[PDB]
A paper describes a structure:
Indeed, the one-carbon metabolism enzyme MTHFD2 stands out as the most consistently overexpressed metabolic enzyme across human tumors. MTHFD2 enzymatic function supports rapid cell proliferation during early embryogenesis, after which it is replaced by the mitochondrial protein MTHFD2L in healthy mature tissue.
The tool compound TH7299, as well as two of the most promising candidates, TH9028 and TH9619, were chosen to investigate the MTHFD2 mechanism of action and cancer biology. Furthermore, we determined the cocrystal structures of TH7299, TH9028 and TH9619 in complexes with human MTHFD2 to assess their binding mode and identify critical interactions in the binding pocket. Treatment with TH7299 resulted in approximately 50% reduction of RF speed and significantly shorter DNA fibers; meanwhile supplementation with thymidine was sufficient to fully rescue replication speeds. To assess the cancer specificity of the replication defects caused by MTHFD2 inhibitors, we treated AML and nontumorigenic LCL cells with TH7299, TH9619, MTX or the ATR inhibitor VE-821. Although MTX and VE-821 significantly blocked DNA RF progression in both cancer and nontumorigenic cells, MTHFD2 inhibitors effectively impaired DNA replication only in AML cells, sparing nontumorigenic lymphocytes. In accordance with this, we found that MTHFD2 inhibitors TH7299 and TH9619 are synergistic when combined with ATR inhibitors VE-821 or VE-822 in both AML HL-60 and THP-1 cells, as well as in bone cancer cell lines U2OS and TC71, increasing apoptosis in a time- and dose-dependent manner.
Residue numbers in the entry:
A (entry chain A), B (entry chain A): 35 to 280, 287 to 332
Write the structure that this text describes.
């Protein structure tokens, strides 16, 4: 079978065009231009590259952005101080702290310091609790991106079988939460039958579940975790992995094998990555309009 | 095969004996006896019967209890007023509001009014968020009960297949959250591979998942949902359903059929019900000692 290769870049262009229109109508009428603040700690090159993609996307949709660079040596107290100032500044609509942080800093304490109304990553414990109760909330950008790839392509979820490989609190768990929950709730879900797997799932048991799946979502960070023999013909396969191997970028899916069996497949790069960035822009216009 | 019929009543007696010892050592030394307050609204007979089981269990383990009876006609404002007084009373260690409430009352607002330190049901949004991040929290009594049945019987979960029938925010979702999460986190999980199913799961797809399961947990409220042909030989089957049929009580599992195929089975009544009550007593001694 010849899989349709879904272009995340094209879909993200569509979403960015919608955000720009909303922003330019808001500013034309004399309202404040929206503003996003990013705190970046240390010198990790991939972190610097992701934050650049985020601030360029803001530029192109009419959102002002600032990147605050701090050394890896900063204390927890200093970083909390800086977050309190941004929380109290009425020009600042969204605030996020790029992860990961240095070992001496408690990431959970930092995520809980960001005001929940400006928490455009959806990482504050109140935003996590609201999301797990299917209430209105700021949704994490990568999992919302995965959701939009599925919905805008027209792939059905109600009554369908979904397997998620990965249980991380920022990616795998929220994807599983969105896809299994009730379509009639405040924040609608996808009404799918969902399996979550992880590092202690034996490979034989992962395979027995993925062969039943209409949609397989891999967010494990393991090259070639998903291969053609594990997929039922015509399934949708979404690759959320980003793996640097020796010096190259690859996903969790053996693309070249699975493209011969799936009905739909996302590439790495150029799939979920651009969709993460686009959904962040949507969260920022939502924070700026104060409707949540 | 002859299934071992697990006695929830015997297991709950063991847990209540442990709680009584802890309470009587605490009071012998001159500390305040623990105290649990229950608010019961309206005249639902099953609600009145569950609350009686709760206050009798408190009596037998040395915990003082009060049941506050209010008419179904009470306003949201009056009920919030009463919760504020109990929250501010230092004699009161645990506070819970029996559900369901009348249609004119917003249950979510009421659950979020209970102080999170006295929230022995685990229903406040902060307790829900902490639980979904695998942090120390007050766990909901029915899902903790299900967990204790599995652990005290000696049934393994790490790398095993689990199916949960039901996605309710007070029962099915928390059971799924506890069983799939990491054993090394602050609040350890069970490291199982978990499928969640619900009202839009077709019966044919429920069956294709349950035949792979080492543990099947039914929390749907549908008589005879689980039948012998859906179970692999030697599996553990936990019945969390409580269904009044015409005038009789039954679970979600066809007990008489599944007892011939499973390795372990819980009865209704006398299974998960007594374990819900016992784990509530454990949450109350935890709230009274102020260690969380
Ligand atoms: N926009 C994007 O595309 C985007 C954004 C963030 C992260 N990611 C990628 O997602 C992947 C994981 O991201 P994360 O934030 O969850 O990091 P993480 O490393 O915490 O995730 C690892 C998760 O995968 C699970 N896992 C490990 N081995 C497994 C196996 N053999 N089978 C099944 N599951 C297994 C773990 O138990 C854990 O939950 C990485 O490749 C990362 O680069 C992509
Ligand atoms: N201690 C105890 O034993 C205890 C405590 C509370 C509730 N319960 C029982 O648990 C059952 C459900 O409790 P609840 O609080 O979740 O109430 P609920 O009625 O909200 O739960 C129904 C859930 O089951 C799902 N469901 C409905 N039909 C289904 C089907 N055909 N296949 C799979 N799933 C389906 C729904 O989508 C929903 O998530 C009831 O029988 C109730 O009496 C037992
Ligand atoms: N706070 C916070 N920290 C985090 N670490 C994340 N994750 C978080 O930024 N991920 C991410 C991953 C990839 C890209 C990206 O632009 N990917 C492109 C280009 C790949 C590359 O340059 O290597 C692609 O996949 O096509 C953007 C963001 C987040 O959303 N919030
Ligand atoms: N706030 C709040 N509201 C709620 N509705 C619940 N659920 C909530 O009390 N369930 C429950 C169910 C059954 C029994 C019980 O004692 N069952 C016995 C006897 C059955 C009967 O008398 O009908 C058994 O199954 O063996 C106790 C509590 C809760 O935990 N907290």
């Amino acid at each position: 079978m010849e899989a349709v290769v879904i272009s995340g870049r094209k879909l993200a262009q569509q979403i960015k065009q919608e955000v720009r229109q909303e922003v330019e109508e808001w500013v034309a009428s004399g309202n404040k231009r929206p503003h996003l603040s990013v705190i970046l700690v240390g010198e990790n090159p991939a972190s610097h590259s992701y934050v650049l993609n985020k601030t360029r996307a803001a530029a192109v949709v009419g959102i002002n952005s600032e990147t605050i660079m701090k050394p890896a040596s900063i204390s927890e107290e200093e970083l909390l101080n800086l977050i309190n100032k941004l929380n109290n500044d009425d020009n600042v609509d969204g605030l996020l702290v790029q992860l990961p942080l240095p070992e001496h800093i408690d990431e959970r304490r930092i995520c809980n310091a960001v005001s929940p109304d400006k928490d455009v990553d959806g990482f504050h414990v109140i935003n996590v609790g609201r999301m797990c109760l299917d209430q209105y909330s700021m949704l994490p950008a990568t999992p919302w991106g995965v959701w939009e790839i599925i919905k805008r392509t027209g792939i059905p979820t109600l009554g369908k079988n979904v397997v998620v490989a990965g249980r991380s609190k920022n990616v795998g768990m929220p994807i599983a939460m969105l896809l299994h929950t009730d379509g009639a709730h405040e924040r609608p879900g996808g009404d799918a039958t969902v399996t979550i797997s992880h590092r202690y799932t034996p490979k034989e048991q992962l395979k027995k579940h993925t062969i039943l799946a209409d949609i397989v979502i891999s967010a494990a960070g393991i090259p070639n975790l998903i291969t053609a023999d594990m997929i039922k013909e015509g399934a949708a396969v979404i690759d959320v992995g980003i793996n640097r191997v020796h010096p190259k970028l690859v996903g969790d899916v053996d693309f070249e094998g699975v493209r011969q069996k799936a009905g739909y497949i996302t590439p790495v790069p150029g799939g979920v990555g651009p969709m993460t960035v686009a959904m962040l822009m949507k969260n920022t216009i939502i924070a700026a309009k104060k409707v949540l």
